[PDB]
Write a protein that binds this ligand. Sequence first.
Ligand code: CLA
Ligand code: CLA
Ligand SMILES: CC1=C(C#C/C(C)=C/C=C/C(C)=C/C=C/C=C(C)/C=C/C=C(\C)C#CC2=C(C)C[C@@H](O)CC2(C)C)C(C)(C)C[C@H](O)C1
Ligand SMILES: CC1=C(C#C/C(C)=C/C=C/C(C)=C/C=C/C=C(C)/C=C/C=C(C)/C=C/C2=C(C)CCCC2(C)C)C(C)(C)C[C@H](O)C1
Ligand SMILES: CC1=C(C#C/C(C)=C/C=C/C(C)=C/C=C/C=C(C)/C=C/C=C(C)/C=C/C2=C(C)CCCC2(C)C)C(C)(C)C[C@H](O)C1
Ligand code: SF4
Ligand code: SF4
Lengths: 104, 219, 34, 162, 151, 139, 80, 174
Amino acid sequence: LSVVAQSKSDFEISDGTPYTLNVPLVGAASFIGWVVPTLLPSQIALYGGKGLSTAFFASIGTNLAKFPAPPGMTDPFWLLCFIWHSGLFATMILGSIGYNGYAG
Amino acid sequence: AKSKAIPFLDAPPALSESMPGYVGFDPLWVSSMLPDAGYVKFLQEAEIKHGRVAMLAAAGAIVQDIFTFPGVKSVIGDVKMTSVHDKFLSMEAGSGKGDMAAMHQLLLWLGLLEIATSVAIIQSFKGETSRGPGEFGFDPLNFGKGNSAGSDSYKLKEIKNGRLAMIGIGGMVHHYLLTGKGPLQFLGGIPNYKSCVSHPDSLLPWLFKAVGPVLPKIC
Amino acid sequence: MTAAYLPSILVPIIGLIFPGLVMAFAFIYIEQDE
Amino acid sequence: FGGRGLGVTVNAERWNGRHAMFGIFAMVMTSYMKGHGLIPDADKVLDIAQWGPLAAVWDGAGNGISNERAIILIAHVHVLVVSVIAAIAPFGFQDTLVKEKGYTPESPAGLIPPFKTGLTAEAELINGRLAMLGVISIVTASLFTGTSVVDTINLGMGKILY
Amino acid sequence: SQFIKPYNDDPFVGNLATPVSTSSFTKSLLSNLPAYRAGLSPLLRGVEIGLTHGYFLVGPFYKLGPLRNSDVALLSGFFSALGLIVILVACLTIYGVVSFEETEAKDQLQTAKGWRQFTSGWLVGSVGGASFAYILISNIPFLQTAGMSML
Amino acid sequence: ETLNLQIPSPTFEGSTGGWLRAAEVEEKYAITWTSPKEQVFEMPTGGAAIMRQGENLLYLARKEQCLALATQVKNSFKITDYKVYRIFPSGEVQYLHPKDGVFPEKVNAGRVGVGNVSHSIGKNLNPAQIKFTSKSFNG
Amino acid sequence: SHSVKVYDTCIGCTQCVRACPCDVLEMVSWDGCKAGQIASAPRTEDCIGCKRCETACPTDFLSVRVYLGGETTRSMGLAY
Amino acid sequence: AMSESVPFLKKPEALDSSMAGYAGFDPLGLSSIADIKFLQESEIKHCRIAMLAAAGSIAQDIFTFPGVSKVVGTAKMTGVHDVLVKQGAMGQILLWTSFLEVFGTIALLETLDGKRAPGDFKFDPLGFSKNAETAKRYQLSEIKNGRLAMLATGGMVHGYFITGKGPLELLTNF
Ligand code: CLA
Ligand code: CLA
Ligand SMILES: CC1=C(C#C/C(C)=C/C=C/C(C)=C/C=C/C=C(C)/C=C/C=C(\C)C#CC2=C(C)C[C@@H](O)CC2(C)C)C(C)(C)C[C@H](O)C1
Ligand SMILES: CC1=C(C#C/C(C)=C/C=C/C(C)=C/C=C/C=C(C)/C=C/C=C(C)/C=C/C2=C(C)CCCC2(C)C)C(C)(C)C[C@H](O)C1
Ligand SMILES: CC1=C(C#C/C(C)=C/C=C/C(C)=C/C=C/C=C(C)/C=C/C=C(C)/C=C/C2=C(C)CCCC2(C)C)C(C)(C)C[C@H](O)C1
Ligand code: SF4
Ligand code: SF4
């Protein structure tokens, strides 16, 4: 949140060009636009009957219960974490492109 | 321009005669070690902060020898003057294993206040504030009659009593570290090393390693 | 070995201090205008 | 270069003199200190298993530095660290080891400086010349007599120490 | 909109005004670092840089040095940090001797006196930060391991 | 004659190939020329710039960079109205090229020959005769 | 700097002057050759030592000879 | 220009006395990192959610709705969350509060642009703030109870993590 959507800060993306990073709207919209489709369940051993967002959030809670111990190599946490953040970063990139550039 | 405390020595350049608790005593010129404008201010706040903490510590040691609060005796047992610090820390999460957070709660709230005082010291160093050393505005009952900073005499009283308490709390700590008696037993027991209290090694025993084979070790 | 303390004294000095001193003073000498 | 107060100058004379006076004190103190056996485990040989190959000595028996040498070395490491910090970051009033090069040198004393019994520069220089002369004297006396330097100091001072 | 422009309005200087080079965040970080922060004497710049560098130097020597599996690992790591500090202070001093002519100006880093001040402060702060790291690691078992005491 | 410092420069987006710290502390070179058009050229230090109609001015770090651009403009756009200057950090400007108003490959009166040797190249002196002597090998 | 010489075998073809990237050479008047002109080297402080002049020269052994000498910022071709 | 709440610190620059609940409390300088209006909207949001959370804690001690004891046996404070994710309650409140948050996101963008006050959704059906003398009192009061409810919600849920009793049962069974 180096600059919000409103014309309030003076943050310049470069030396003399001010540019509104829309960090609240892009982060919120990209999160919801990635999490809501990702709720789609799947009877696969990695998901376990949940969606990718929900199985991922479940694996966060399971590994946080055993807080000092890290998840193992064969644990589903790493693959869930990778795919989730991969599609999340892709949706933030595409959302920032769409919102900042097309402006509507 | 000679100094009052030491007449033959030349007066320390950074110190000003307008600073409370000044008698021209700085032979090593620690006040000149940084060229900055607010280093003298920083050192003055340091001296006051060390003095106030030492005064609480000196009062605490005397009161702990007098009495203790209810229920403390059943947890800590017979530990006084820094042994109680180690004893609590043996029963606290993180440092030891137990159901207490006594030193940790003190660390938490003292550290919150002390990050606030950090911002005050940082602002006072760079001249952004016209606040003097030690003044945090804390004066709920009117003692300085309209200024929280107090009168020249009362800050001189504070600074001198702080210096006294630094010397005294150092004395009390080391006399305990070897006799094990604590303040009032040591002051009562003016013949000392004759019978001393068996007390635990501290969390820094190495410093008690030249007492035996190099220094005499009367105890 | 007789005077066996000598390698443990002289080898660190000859191998570290002597080059560190000649590098420092050679550096100063080769980069002075006068 | 050597116009920084280095070389055969009175600044170097004064600095070496101060070190020699501390050194005479340190030699007297270590002689007295090991005469009474107040250096702990002085004969105990340090193990390479704990300290690594820097402790090795290659004397035929034990093959390691003794604890007494290590303790004396650490004492001098304490004063070397103080020495470096005082050379590079000296006190405000302290006489500096390296001069500006635009400084005016102190006048050389001569055969004997004027006798000033205070905490003066004359007393410091007299005692410093005397201590440096003492350092060389003790070294040569110990070398020809065959005795160790500690025993030589004890005999020269008349066995007060031990 | 374009994010890459000539550096300081000059199209023919050998630099560009890119977001990494000249954004508000970069300028805030650069302007607030001790080397560039306003209102600091060179000695104080040296102290803050030294405290930082001396503090992190202790750790690699202690964890990965030759005596790491001994009980003198922290002692050897601190002393190794000290040895590096002394060598680096020698490097700073000889740089100052050969790079700056002697002038009265002392409040800038790139002057003879200003460099000598920065070197004095850097040595003091560096030994101070290494000493502080020694104290913290000596007393706290979490730091002695990599956090491995919790498992 | 002197460099009018106010001459607008060719439009350029900047590059890393331009001049460094030695230009503002040792010397910089400038080149000026007249263009009949607003046209694209290639900079000696990098990509493409656009010269403005009328008078242009550049700053380069090397004299050879000024002359490389000058040959490029003369062949590509038939522009010979180029003047190359040397500029010192004291502000003093030294006119360089063409040195006497006439290009070096065209003869001019009042040019004095420098470096001319009165014999052919094989008539030089062997090194041994001029050893421990200040006498030059060119006869 | 580098030292550049022009020997009297020069036929005045001007090829060295056109080939020089740093404007070291120029043409001066001389009655020795048919072309009536000889090369001259008045600005050898700018000579970088490229020897493009020597490549351009058509006399059997070169009328222009560059002798590489002391190095400077100019003769090293350093833009830094 | 010194902070009212913290007398030894300079008054925060981004903050102003026109703001409801203002006491000059920003010793860390977080009002400069993020935009102040985003921070106010965030604070008022947190305030209302924690006010509901604290009253819900107290009321779920005081009584339960008909048939609730059938579904939740012994689960008291956050155990009821765990058993009612199985049942449909948590998915339902999540869905409908997320529905409201969509228009809240539009309103947050609007208040960033500057058309709307933070936390202002024009929800005054009973016309409590119509006079406007009460409005300001209600504004400051809402911020104060919100802050108290944030601290209280934390302090009850952590009291329940310790004892398992829940707020009123912790008090009555000391
Ligand atoms: C992953 C999600 C996603 C995708 C696929 C798109 C795709 C698109 N958006 Mg949308 N957008 C998104 C998220 C996304 N957006 C979010 C979160 C926001 C809000 C912050 C917006 C806001 C927004 C606005 C305001 C506008 C768009 C517009 C567009 C279109 C062209 C511009 C563009 O971004 O080029 C993207 C180009 C493509 C996707 C096609 C190229 C094909 C390649 C293969 C791209 C693939 C990239 C990547 C691998 C796909 C990942 C998918 C998934 C696994 C994450 C395009 C159909 C504009 C438009 O045309 O209006 C309808 C427009 O006005 N978007
Ligand atoms: C963040 C707040 C929060 C959360 C997550 C929960 C979560 C839960 N509550 Mg608790 N509860 C809350 C607040 C909360 N409650 C409040 C505010 C009250 C009233 C003081 C209660 C009273 C309550 C009871 C009595 C019971 C629960 C129960 C439950 C469980 C099932 C849901 C249910 O039946 O709710 C029922 C809750 C309500 C009907 C209260 C809703 C209050 C609304 C939202 C206030 C908004 C009013 C306003 C006019 C609307 C304006 C909209 C605006 C945005 C424009 C569940 C674990 C049940 C359970 O299992 O307990 C063991 C149960 O029996 N809750
Ligand atoms: C400021 C402020 C306020 C406040 C407050 C408070 C809490 C103020 C506290 C003041 C205190 C606690 C002062 C204590 C000083 C102690 C000294 C000087 C003693 C040193 C010991 C010596 C020399 C010794 C010794 C010893 C030796 C070495 C050997 C030992 O074996 C024994 C022995 C003991 C003999 C209030 C709240 C009113 C508000 C107000 O508006 C602002
Ligand atoms: C909790 C904890 C512990 C602890 C602890 C604590 C609280 C330790 C505190 C230690 C302190 C404060 C020692 C003070 C020493 C003061 C001295 C030597 C004064 C010198 C003044 C002089 C010479 C004055 C000279 C002078 C006078 C007289 C007159 C002339 C002028 C002047 C030059 C000013 C541990 C570490 C033990 C371990 C334990 O497990 C955990
Ligand atoms: C994981 C879990 C769940 C849950 C859950 C929930 C509801 C979790 C909620 C957690 C909350 C709200 C924690 C709040 C803590 C407040 C703090 C630390 C403030 C301290 C105040 C300080 C430091 C100082 C304050 C102040 C004072 C005193 C003096 C200094 C100045 C000032 C700042 C004013 C579920 C629902 C899924 C169930 C599941 O079975 C388990
Ligand atoms: S060597 Fe290169 S620079 Fe020198 S005269 Fe010949 S062509 Fe010109
Ligand atoms: S030196 Fe060679 S190239 Fe140059 S003019 Fe003479 S003949 Fe032509």
